[PDB]
Each structure stands twice: as structure tokens, then as C-alpha cells.
Amino acid sequence: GRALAFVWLMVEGAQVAAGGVAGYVRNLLDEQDALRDHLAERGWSVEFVLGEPFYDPGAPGYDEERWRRVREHLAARGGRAVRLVSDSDGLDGWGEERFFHALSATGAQLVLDTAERCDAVVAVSGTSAFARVPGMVQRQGGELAAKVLHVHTFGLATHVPSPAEIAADGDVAFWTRQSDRVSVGYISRYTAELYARTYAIPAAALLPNRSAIPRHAPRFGVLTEERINERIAGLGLPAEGEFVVMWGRNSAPGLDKGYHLLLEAARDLPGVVPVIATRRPDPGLRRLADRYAVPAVLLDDQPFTHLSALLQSPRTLAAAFLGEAEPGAVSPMEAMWVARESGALVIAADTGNLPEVVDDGAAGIVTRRTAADVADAVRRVRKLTADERRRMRAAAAARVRARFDFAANVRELADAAVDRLAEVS
Amino acid sequence: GRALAFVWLMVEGAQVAAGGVAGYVRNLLDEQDALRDHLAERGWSVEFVLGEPFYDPGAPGYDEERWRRVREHLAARGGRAVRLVSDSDGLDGWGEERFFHALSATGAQLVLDTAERCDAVVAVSGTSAFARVPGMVQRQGGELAAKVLHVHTFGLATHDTAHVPSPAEIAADGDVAFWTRQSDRVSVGYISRYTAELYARTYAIPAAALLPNRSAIPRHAPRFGVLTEERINERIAGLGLPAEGEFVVMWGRNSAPGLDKGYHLLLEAARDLPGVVPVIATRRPDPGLRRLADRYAVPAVLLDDQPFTHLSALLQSPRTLAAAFLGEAEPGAVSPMEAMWVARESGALVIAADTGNLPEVVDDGAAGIVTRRTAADVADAVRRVRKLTADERRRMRAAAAARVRARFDFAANVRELADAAVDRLAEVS
Amino acid sequence: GRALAFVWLMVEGAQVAAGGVAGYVRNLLDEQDALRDHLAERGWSVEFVLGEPFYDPGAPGYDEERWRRVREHLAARGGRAVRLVSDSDGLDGWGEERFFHALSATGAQLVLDTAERCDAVVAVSGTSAFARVPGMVQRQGGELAAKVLHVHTFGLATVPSPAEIAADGDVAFWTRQSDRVSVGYISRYTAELYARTYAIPAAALLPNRSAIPRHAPRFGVLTEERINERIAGLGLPAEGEFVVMWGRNSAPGLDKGYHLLLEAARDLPGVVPVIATRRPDPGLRRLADRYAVPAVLLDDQPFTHLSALLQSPRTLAAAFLGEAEPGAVSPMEAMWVARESGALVIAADTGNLPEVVDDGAAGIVTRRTAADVADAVRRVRKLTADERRRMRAAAAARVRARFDFAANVRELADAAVDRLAEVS
Amino acid sequence: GRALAFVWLMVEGAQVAAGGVAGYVRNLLDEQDALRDHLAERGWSVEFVLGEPFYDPGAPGYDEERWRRVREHLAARGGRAVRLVSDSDGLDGWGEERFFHALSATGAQLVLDTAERCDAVVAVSGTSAFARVPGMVQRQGGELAAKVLHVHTFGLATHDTAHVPSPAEIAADGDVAFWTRQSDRVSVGYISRYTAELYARTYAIPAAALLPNRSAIPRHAPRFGVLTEERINERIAGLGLPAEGEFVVMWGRNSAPGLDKGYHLLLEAARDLPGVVPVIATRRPDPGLRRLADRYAVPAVLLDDQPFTHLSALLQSPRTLAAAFLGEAEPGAVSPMEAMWVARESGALVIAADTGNLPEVVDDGAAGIVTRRTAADVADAVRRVRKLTADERRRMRAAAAARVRARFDFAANVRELADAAVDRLAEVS
């Protein structure tokens, strides 16, 4: 009576790796053995089942060898990776009604077939593509469905999504209210609040699946001053100036990252040099800096090795996250973590999950989204004594360890799911 | 800037009539001319448009002469009735994804085509089958969509039935809830206290997106006339009622999946009620209730396709103890309102289940008897009606009649909807 | 490279048994050991996988014990039964687009999961509910899909629902498009019909021909003692030569033709129609009296009593007079149970009926008029006892040769294995 | 009994114009008055109704002034233009199941709403997106459906593309093929020899359900006028053409996931064609063609959003050796007919892929050069054009122009459609 399975239903991560869902799957597999050991102590024998839509080898980001490494990793542990029919051509990984409906039907199939051979199943489904899985299983699965707890995560349609997304998320919201076995896995304090209010999700049906980073990954290593300086040598940084760093996607219609707010505020920050690394070159930001006579360094297509060096440089005053609400950005967590010994302190807008990340001012600086507010937040960082920066840097590093550690947060999900199984049963 | 159209998207009401939606269409057509006069005082020239799915002549409740009268009534006033494609047989006024999707698309079409030839449109869509209309119009209709205020109304997917709503119902009502919070031009018309609280608590719809469309009856309709004792006995003489016993009356659409009208509860309770004769009038014959009555050895009069003249007489007869309404989760049933009103002088008192809108109708017990949905509770409710003091029987009858006048008057409630829609339109401009 | 699986995708037959698909599943499992033996000698180790939509225990025909038996039968043989999500409540076993789409998606999933652990798969899918399975596997399954041969069987739309038309049009497209997609025809009639109606290439038509399990006890030869014992309660006249018909009542757009025999009996002195319908038929009563025809009209009769009727030396013929049906097995049953005595078969010239009676060599073909029926009966009466011997033997041999379930499921397996080799 | 409507259900042609369907709508409207006169002689009074899916102003090819012109053109003749709900954003004239199902439902609605006010309707539906309209009308429309003859036409799901048609395309065209066989009132309008043979061989459609709707051009349109050498040079002068080299011209909608126009095949072949300059004018700019030309070091001139005046000049210039049409499976392309006609005096000869309707257009080699769809064959085809004797070049140019006159004249071919539909209408009655 102790065979426990986690079924991870993910739109990418094995055959294809091209975004945040795939990173989640990879950190998951790195944590599998530790999670197995942890749950053995609670008396469960854990296996992992991974479900991913069939991809065509010509899909963007397809990697036959990554698929093979995933399959071997899970098989070596008595788990399995299963490619799922999605009534599609295999080139995308997203779609409309037909894609969502078929992939949810076969994701549900995988859950029930896993329930057939196990004693208990935690089905962790992600995105609108799998949002119908809980209702399909719980409506039709009979005694097998009563072995399953669903945790559906990674976004509910927010108030323009497609009709397919609206309907699928409306379906999972219905089933979360309807069934004791359907929970929403919230990725942040912000989405837990949003979904309770927006979808009338009951508190008892909200379960933590909180976004985090894998703190021990090599890409987060602390760098020496010597290595920092040789990595940033080709970035064209000025010999003088305190850097305030931002990076990410270019601002877009409906996606204001707020880079312009730093450039505007830098007008009133003598000795501050904005350093902004966008996905692609940004002529608009160049024209804005030239108009304001602000000496910004504007980079593009920078690798994280180089952002980390920038963030760690003693010349770097802060890292700024000034964008509109996002539910689960991990970039500010990466900044607080790689700067654990030197460099940036974090300035965060009061939107989305950012206040939670900087602990509402205890591990970083919160600002409203205006140039004057951002200017005042920058000089609040400059005003800190060396000792005060040391305390806030330590607080930010501790906050990542305490709240945004991937190993702890997936353990938190598993414990909550196992606890909820017992309570429902 | 004066041509205002109400577009009513209704799953029945002209070719087909079986339940409350069709009664609603009859009610608004009877009130249309008065509504036109009233809205003209508020500065609008009002036209009515009715969209109903094409039906096959084999459909239950089909009457092509009713379709003729409705189409001609509307045409004589410059309005129109329009039969709507729903990608189906036409043999049923419900369906799944294909039915909902095609009907919402063509209902959306009718809205936008009306918007193109008018200055403003109030699009009143009813039930999950049309719940996607607001989103289809507002997503794709461009400038024509900006002339429309949506009011989506009537029954919806809920957590209050043992039968789980279909995926199509769940998706559609999720879609319209999304659009109430996404669009200034998408409101829901609550038909009852029960649906209003459901919109806020289940669907998280903001209070500003709620508009009144409260279930009600046309009190002055001749079919609600008080009857003489002679005319009562005349009408019930051909119903096969036993010479002895007191009647508990029920009527309505047959129970079906997703629609538990609770007739079986009265039959069950009647084997503990020795002098009680259930009288159950369903739209269609119902062999299933006959098997239940037989199985229980319950003497019950099971009727079908009864005209309201005969139901009214049954409700007013001194031989009738009660009329019972035992639906699992009525969103906004008007039949208990009809009983309270037609019995204002004599006859039945109302027994109502403690679910859906029924407690609001009987004023939580001041205007009728509230019962849990079990055979033992229903039997105890019949006994409660029997044991009332004379003063309490008179008081409850008067209170029920007064509640219909104050809360469930169709002329008042449809004017409330229309005044709220005209105000909301002014707000969004 | 020797692991072969047959994946049978069926809307019923384990959790639920109500119609012909369930009977097919039951006869197939009885034949599994023989098929395994037969295919082992062709170099294949054979596993059976059964996929059926999840049913609720309240579904009509639900039997938890039949489900357990099928489960044990397949597990004992290294196979499995798999219940399939169909995005439905589990009460029906049929539905619309949502049901067809989900059930085909998970049917396709079961095929591909089977292909992952085997070397070759024959995916036998049935009815419009699984008709999208070949397309979903072959469009998206990659290298796993190239291990699969699809045989889609049990009906193409020939007024069906939009969902049936679309699903069957999809599989027709895929049968033309893909070397790995075949249509399993159940009769000579449907093989011709699908070639003409759906432009199915000849190389994509594969036999899955309807048949009966000849050796089932329900087809046992009865002594005259047992025959007379079983028909004693049927209210048969002391005199008269019977012409027997049985099956469903005639319904709108599905005329079984019972009235044609009653009308023809007006011109058949000494012939007594015996008609056993599913439910009582007051219309047939009204019509027998109108014509002063002495008919025996029965309802709800078990095959034990039908078989006794068909075997009685008093029975002249069994008649099958309805409009086109693609794969009726009732006339095969009549030809088989009368192999030693009783009825010879009269068949309308519709659907699979001419094939069944070998176009007159194993029975009497008739046009669907009362005069033709009466004439057909006269021809049966005219036959000498030696000609009746000839035709009864031809009819029994025809069932053994063409309508034997064990042979026809072997014929399917051999055709699919040959097709597999040819595609590689 | 004289009121006849043609309902044209078109995925583009008013709000949006990019390809052949929109060109057909334009040709049709210009020919409307002559069709009305001609059908008046056969006893019918004819109205045109146009249905096109709602588009957002951001859709490619959108022009609000074109929409207004079409709407006024039809209104002035007592007809109408109707934008149709398709349950989509309006950013694209295609989609999957949702788009197909909603647009077919509202197309069917427009057909039936037209049948209610007319005596007879010819419903011309185009492409897979409307292929379910005949079945939707005929299944559910009752007496109104009995006034309609359906003619379904244009591109469809085939086995002739490397990209497999989508499930929605396969289902919809399977559905119209079924209804063609099931209903006397459902025909398909073949636009080419290729689609006629495909209807019969792929979809088993009976020959009596096929009516002609053969792709054609309005030869007398001013845009097909012969140009002087001076006017040719003035129009080509602003296109950035190199001083030296002979041109091979292509133009059309950009290639897209289910639409391989073969532009890349010409750029490929040009690596083996030292004196040849490809000139490719796509509706939209096309970064990918520039990357391919750069990768191949081919000095192609890549144009976008060119007016037909300038394409005509390119095609007539003696510097132009050929116009190439290299689509994978054109159901009925008219662009080769435009080249054959406008170059009747000078300029291009036509190179046509050996697939789709293209071999029929060039009379299997008598009116142009047929090529297999490979780079090596396309380059061979260009060389074959160069090596023609003077007599054969002259003869081919004349044969090409004569073929358009004889087989691809729009005024004759749209009259042929209308006469065949009117004949078919009489037979079903």
C-alpha cells in the first residue's frame, strides 16, 4: 500500500527544451533521488512519471539526446517518460481546442494508467494545455480516480487569451471548487491571492508549488574579482560610474519591463550608469538615453555568465526589476542569489510577485513605477552604509535559501500533496 | 441616436415551448408595447428581435402556429423573429459543444447584424447554450460590438446538483464569467437571490457586472384569474381525481439528467401520508413516475400535457392541501410564484425545497413551507400544512399573494431590467 | 524483433456488453490461444491488448464480473485490458465530437504506448468513435507510428451525425493517404461500397469478415424431442409449414420486411408465418388479421427457441427480407443451425444477404415484393427432398467456408501480418 | 416566384484582399449587372449577398475603404454585404476547428436568412472554411433549405501536398463530400480539370453533383491592357532592377505552412543560371526569401505590395524571359492566366509546375513550359525558354493568349456557372 507516483504533465522538458517549463522538469529530475529519500521516511516508495506531447524531430528546440538522457534517468529509477498524443503535427507544443482537448485526454489517460499500477498518484499538470486533466480523470475514472490528487499549476487565464485558454482554465477552476481531489498549485503569494479572488478558488484547494531557483547549479557560482573583470571586459563599460543593471526581454505591446523608467531616473542620479541587457538590440532605448544625455550601456543577447559577473561586480550598485505585474519572475531571485557575496542589491517594482521576492523591503528595495520613485529608490541604495548593504545582501541571500530554493519548494509541494491525500482519504 | 434593439437569444419560446424560458418570451411579448411606451419616455425607440434555434417539427413542444403568431406579432411592430442555425437535428433545445458553439455563433451574428442597422443593442442571452455570445461579439465585432450591452442570464453550471454539468456547460459559463470581468459591456442578469450570490461566490463576478432580471409572473394574465367554485369543479371533473382524499399538486417539465424536479420525492413521501393523493402533471406522459407510484402502491393521479386552465383549478380547489416544488437547484423557478398567486383566494399553500431560488420565493417560511429534499421531510411538510391554525393558513395565503405583488411582478421586473440596461448603456458611453 | 501486439479498440465488450461489438470481443478472446499458436509458427510472439472507454457501474449492460474475467483472461496471457478516457460521464458508450475525439486520442495513446514496448502493432479500431485513431497515430507518432498497421472496421457512414461523418471522412482520408492505414471490410457488400463511396484503394481493403462461432453450444443440433419440447409453449397451429423470421421490430428508415411475408402468405396455402420480434408488434397483428393470414407472432424469444423453430421438420424456410444491412449474421445463424434439418434460407437482394446465400447456390434470393417473396416460397416448396438436401448442405458448407469466426479472425491476422511485411 | 439570390460565402474579398478568392469577388461584382441582365432573360430577378468573416483592421490586406465600396456596390443593387462571426480575433482569414465551425454556422445562417425572404437561393461557399455550410443548411433548415442549391467550390484538403491538411480541413471537406452524395441540393463547383478529377477520384463525388466554376480572368479589365515600350520603362524604372540580366518573374501571396508557392525553387535554380535575375513580388516583404537569396549569392530583386500596373509592366518588358508559377498544388490559380494574357504582345512566356491546375493552364506544354518541381528542372525550364526558335516563341505566346480567351474568360465562365446553377435549380424542382 505504499507505491506513490508523481505524474508530471508538462508541455516541454524532455524532447524539447525552450522555456521555463523545461527548466522545471530538469531541476525536478535533479531532485528526484533526494525527494525519493525524503518520502521514504514518510513511508512512501516514490516513482516519477513524465508526460510530454509527442514532438516532431524538426520542432524548435528538439534534442533527441536530451530525450534519451531523460528516458534513461527515469527508467534507471523504475519511472518512465511517456510521449502523449495531442492530435497535432508535433511541431509546436501549443494550439487551440483540438490540441488542448487531446493532450488533456491522453494526460488523463497516463494518470489513470499510473493509478492502475500504484497505490497513490499526485498528478501535477501544467498550463491550459493540461487544465482539463483533473476534470476528465475525476469525472470518469471511478475507483482509479479516487487514488489521485491533482495539483494544477503554471497559470490560469487572467483578466486577451484565446477561447481555448479561457475554457480550459474555467474548467479546472470549476473542478477545483467541485472536487476535494483537485488543487491549484500556486507559484507565488501573488497568484495565490489572485486565483482566490479571480476564480473563487477555496483556500483549502490552494497548494504550494512556489517558483524557485536551483541554488547549487554551477551557473550561480560566486566569482572572483579577477574572473568578474575578465568576463565584463568586452562589455564596453565606462571606467567610472556605479552600475544599475537590468536584463530580460525587450519591452513589447502589453509587456512593459520598465527599462525606460531607469533611464528617466538616471537623469537625476549623478554617477549612476544604467546597464540594460535586452534579448535583442533596442534602438528605442538608445534614442531615449541620447535624448536625456544619460550614459547608459545597452547590451543585447548576453549570456548569464556575463550577467552574473555584472551583478557581482563591486562596481555594481543595484539590479532593477521595474516591469508590469508578472506572476512568477525568477530573475530577481537569481540576482539576490548570485550577489550573495558582492555587487548588486535588488530594486523591485511593487507589482506581481516582486514585493514577495524582496520580502516587502527587508531583502531589497521596493519602488512605485515612476521615474521619480525609481530615482529615490536608487539613492536609498546609495545612502546605505557598507554595513547596511552587508546586512541587506545577507538578508537577500537568506531569503532565496528560505523561500526560493528549488529543492525545498518541490519538497514543500510533495509534503503538501501527501498530506492532502491523507486528509482527503 | 434613438433606435434601441433588445435582442433576445432564447433556447425556446416560439417554435417550441415547454418551460420557464418559453414562458419568459411569452411574458416579454405581452409586455412589449408597454415597454416601448415606457422607454420612449426615456428617449429610446425600442425594437424587439428574437433568436431561437431552428427546430424540427418532431421536437417536444413544437407548434408551428405558435411560431407564426410570434413572428407576426414582432413583424407588426417592426421587429423580427429569427430561427438560428445550431448544427444539429433540431429535435432538442439543448446539446453539447457543437450545439452551443454553432448557436452562440449565430446568436452573435444576429446581435451584430442588429447593431449594424440600429444605434444601440441590449443583447439578452439565456442559458449556457448562449453564454459564449458576449465574448464572440466583443472579441471580433469591432465598431459594431461597441454598440452592444450584453446581459447574460438564466440557468448555468453550478456545484449544487448531484449530476455534474457537462464540459460544454462548464466551459461556456466559464467563458461568460471571464468576459464580465474583462469587458465593460458584459453583464449578467440575475434572476434570483440564489443566482446573484452564485455569480459573486462561484464565478467571482464583480458586483458592478450584475443587473436585475428577476424571475416574475404576469399577475394580470387572465389565466391567473380567481375561479368560482362551480368553474373549479367543472374543470377538474374530467381529470380522474378520486372522490376522497386531499391533493398535493406538482407540475412542470419531466425530470431529466441535470433537471431533478423532485416529483419522485412526493411519491415517496405519499406512502407515509394515508389520506393524501399526489397529482403530478408533467409536460410529457412519464412512464417512470407511473412505475414509481406502482412500486410504492401509492394512489397518484399522473397527468400530462395539461393546460394551465386545469392546473389553475386544481390549485384553487378546497380539496387541494398544497402545491409542492422540489427541484434540486432551480436557478429561478416561476411555477411556485404561479401557485402563490392563483391560490390568493383559496386552495393550495406552497411547499418548497430548501435549495435554488425556492426559499426566496416562499420568503424563507413566511409565505410557504420550506422542506429538505427527502421523503420524510416532504411528508412532514405536508403534515405541517394540514395542522396549521386557521389564522395561520389565512395569513400565509395573504403573505404569499402579497409577495408575488411586491417581488415577482413581471411588468415591474422586466421594466427593472430594461431601466438598468438603459442606464448601464449610458454609463459605458 | 518478434514481439507482435494486436490492439483491439472497442466501444464495448468487457465492462459493458450490449451489441455486436461485445460479441466480437467475446469470440475473439475465445480464439486468442489459437491465434497465438498460429502466429507463433509465422515467427511472431503475440500479445492481445484491449482498449475500452471507462464506464460507470451504472451504465446499461455493466457487469463488473465480466470485466474481471476479461481482465484475468488477458493478464494470464501476457496482455492487458485498458480503460480509456473519453471525456464523458461513462454511462453511454457513444456520443458526439468530444467523446469521439477524446476516445480516439486515448485509443491512439494506447496504440503508441504498445508500440513502445513491442516490435510491431496491429491496431484494430472499431466504429466512428475510434475512426480518428489511425490519423492521430500516423500524423504524430514518429518512429513508434512506423511500427503500426491500422485496420479500421465496423462501419463507415453511408442521416449520421456531423461527428460520425467527420470521423469516418478522416479515416477514409488516412486510408488513402497512408500505407499503414487499412479498412477492415466485414462483407463483400461493404468492400464494394467503401471502394465506391469513399474511394478506398483496393490495396487498403483488408478482410475482417463477419462470421459466427460455429462450435458454440447455442448452435447445437437438437433432437426432434428437444425441438418439440421447446416450441410447445409457442402457440403453433397443429398444421402448417412455417416460414420463420426474427430480429428487431421494423422502425422508421429500417424496414425489416416482416409485412412482406405476411402479404405473400395470402398466396401460400398451408404456409404459416412465424415472426419473433424484439418487442410485441401490434401493427403486425393488425396486418395479419386484415389479410386472413394465420400468423404466429412472438416476442422476446431466446435463441434456444428460435433455433428449435429453425430446426423443426415442420419449418419450410427462414426469411430475411429487410433493406440493406452491411453485415447481418442472423442468416448465417439460420443456415448453420439448420445444417441437419429444418429451414432453408430466403434472402432479400440487399446488403450482405446475396453473399450469405451464395447468390442462390446456398439459399433463395428474392426481390423485396410480396409477389417475389411468395414466389421465393413456392420455389422452396417446389424443391425435391434431394434438392433440399443439396441446398441445406451447401448452406452449412457455406457457413464453414466463409462465415466461420475462427477462420475469419485468422484471415484478418494473416492479412495484417502480410501487409506489415509488405509495408516494410 | 421570381426572386433569386446568389449568396457568396467568401473568406476574403471586401475587408481583406490578398489572393485568388478576393480577386474572384472583385471579378464577380464587376460582372454583376451583366449577370442580372442575363438571368432576367431566363425569368429570374437576381440579388447578390456577400458574406465575409469579420476582420480586425490589423489583418493583412485590410482596407476599410474597399469594404465600404463593396457594401455600397451591393446595397445600390438591392443586395447586401454581411460580415460574419467566426469566433476568432479577425487577424487571419483562416484557422482550425473553432474558426471553421463558427464561420460555417454563420454562413449557413446568412443562407437561410436569405432563403426566408427570397424564392430561390444559390449558395456559393468557398474553401474548407465554409465546406460544412451545405450540410448545416440542408440538415436543419427545413422548408427554407428546400429553396437552396449549394455550390461548394475552391481549395480543399488533398493528398497532393507534403504538408498534411489539418484535421479541420479533412473533416470539413469530408463533410461536403458526404452531403454531395446525400442531397440533391448539394453540388461542388470545379474550378479546374484538376479539382474536377480530384472530386471524383479522391472524394468519390458523383458526376451529376459537379457544376463548372472554372478559374478565369476578366480579360477586358484595364489592368490587362497592352503597354507601350515607353510606359513599360517608366513603370519598371522605380523597381530597382539591375542594368544587365534577363528577368524571371514571380508574384503572389507569400508561401506559408500549408501553401508552398515555390518561390524558393526559382532562387535555387538561379544558382545555375548565370544571366538570370529572379524578380519575386510577394504580397508582404518576406525576410526568408532574402535570406535564401543571400545564402545562395543570387542577385534577386525582391519586391512587396506591388500594384498590378507594375507587375504588368515587368511581364511585358522584353527584358523578361519568363514568369514562373511553381506552386505545389494550386487548385485553380489564375496568376498564370494573367501572365499569359497580359504578355500577349511581348515579354514573358510562362513556366508552370507540373502539379495542380498549372498543366491545364499551359495546355500541357503547347502554351507554356511545364517543369517538375526541382531546382534542376526549373533551371532546365528557363534554358528551354531561351532556346526556343523564333517561330515557336511567337507561336507559344499566341497559343497562350488564345487559350485565355477560349477557356479562362471570366465573363463567360461566371455565366457558365450561373446557367448551370439555374439549370440545376430547375431540375431539383
Ligand SMILES: Nc1nc2c(ncn2[C@@H]2O[C@H](COP(=O)(O)OP(=O)(O)O)[C@@H](O)[C@H]2O)c(=O)[nH]1
Ligand atoms: N400548462 C402547463 N404549463 C406548464 C407545464 N409545465 C410547465 N409549465 C409552465 O412552464 C413554466 C415553468 O417554468 P419554471 O417553473 O421557472 O421552471 P423551468 O421549466 O425549469 O424553467 C411555468 O410557467 C409553468 O407553469 C404543464 O405541464 N402545463
Ligand SMILES: Nc1nc2c(ncn2[C@@H]2O[C@H](COP(=O)(O)OP(=O)(O)O)[C@@H](O)[C@H]2O)c(=O)[nH]1
Ligand atoms: N497587385 C498584386 N496582385 C497580387 C499580388 N499577389 C497576388 N496577387 C493577385 O491575387 C490573385 C492570386 O490568385 P491565384 O493565382 O489564383 O492564387 P491564390 O492566391 O493562391 O488564390 C491574382 O489575381 C494575383 O494577380 C501582389 O503582390 N500584387
Ligand SMILES: C[N+](C)(C)[C@@H](Cc1c[nH]c(=S)[nH]1)C(=O)O
Ligand atoms: C439542460 N439543462 C442544463 C438541464 C437545462 C437547460 C435550461 C433550460 N432552461 C434553463 S434556465 N436551463 C434545463 O433543461 O433545465
Ligand SMILES: C[N+](C)(C)[C@@H](Cc1c[nH]c(=S)[nH]1)C(=O)O
Ligand atoms: C490555408 N490554406 C489551406 C493553405 C489555403 C486556404 C485557401 C485560400 N484560398 C484557397 S482556394 N484556399 C491557402 O491559404 O491557400
